[PDB]
Amino acid sequence: PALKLALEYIVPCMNKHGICVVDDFLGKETGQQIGDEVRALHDTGKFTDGQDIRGDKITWIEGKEPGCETIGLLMSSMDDLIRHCNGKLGSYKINGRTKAMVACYPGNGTGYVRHVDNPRCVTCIYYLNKDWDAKVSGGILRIFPEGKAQFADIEPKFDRLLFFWSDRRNPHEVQPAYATRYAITVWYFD
Template identity: 50%
Template sequence: MPSARCWSDVELDRVVSQRVVPALSAQGFCWLDGVLGEVGGAAVLEQVRRMHLSGALKGGRLMRAAPGLSGSAVRGDKIAWLSGAERGGDGVNALLMLVDKLVSSAARRLQRHISHRSKAMVACYPGGGAGYVKHVDNPSNDGRCITCIYYLNQNWNSADHGGVLRIFPEGKPYEVDIEPLFDRLVLFWSDRRNPHEVLPSHATRYAVTVWYFDSQEREEAKRLCRERNDSENSTSSDTSVE
């Protein structure tokens, strides 16, 4: 039986310095294959499949309603959120620990103040043409800085199965298609530099996504949110009838 991949600090630093940082700096995105190895990737896949079959994944919700479109017409995935500490969650926990190290190392070299990340969003596109229309993860400076997506799709053939991640790099006259292949990790800037979509999937498609936050932008977003809430509360109080 093949062993799970174990990254040494030297290997991780080399990949970050030679591949991740140059790619994020030059084009705004990159991807790595063979991240956890066959055994490690299979452990994550088993956990995600178990969640899917148990009914733990629910329809993804939109931050804002899209004019003239229902939520399912915009995004067709079913999702759940994990911390990595759940019982039976060793696979996802190992994934998060590795991605944390990768992003932390990259952030230092890129001089970005990454403070924390979201929980892991487990997502399943159940086939039948389910996808996600073109969008930006962080269009409003909410603090999300780097998007990381780990794919779990064995024997995936995009010609038959679809489900490609299509990125539209800002200011470029081309798109980039990335296949959602098993044990592949994609990283890209979460802001307007990388509008992207998930093309219709014709087979069950699994992924795990996390977002890393820029501490300064996140604090500013929280401050503005508090000010809006205070203003709304003040206006509501002023117009109330006794």
């Protein structure tokens, strides 16, 4: 229930850590339906080059396109969490969000050099990779939260939702992927 997830977990977590992970966000059935939609997009060659900086291929999805209705459901689900966060007494307001950025790292040692997404703004990432073994497949998101002496390594696990502040508080990189690695990102801003 968004009301509870936002107010009891996401807000305090974002306040304390600036990074929040929610596993099993939508469940396996819905998650694999999104997986199947992303693969269909990928199989038709609709992804364009995300660019020495990044090896990903991407497409932007509004959520109402034929074949994209479950991706639209994911977006509505993220929207509701953000709405409950920004509706808290004393909170700043979000005025917009991007379309869904569907991204594929097509193995072959592709990754993303360390960067800052927006050098407020929140990055929301939903991962789609079932039984991902990072030891063999790579693709770890390494994040450097401000204030911590350690970095955090986040596996791009199926049905995992990740929030983090998009600004210089959270530089991050995608370590090289050696298997096809899928994710969907939405940025919430202003």
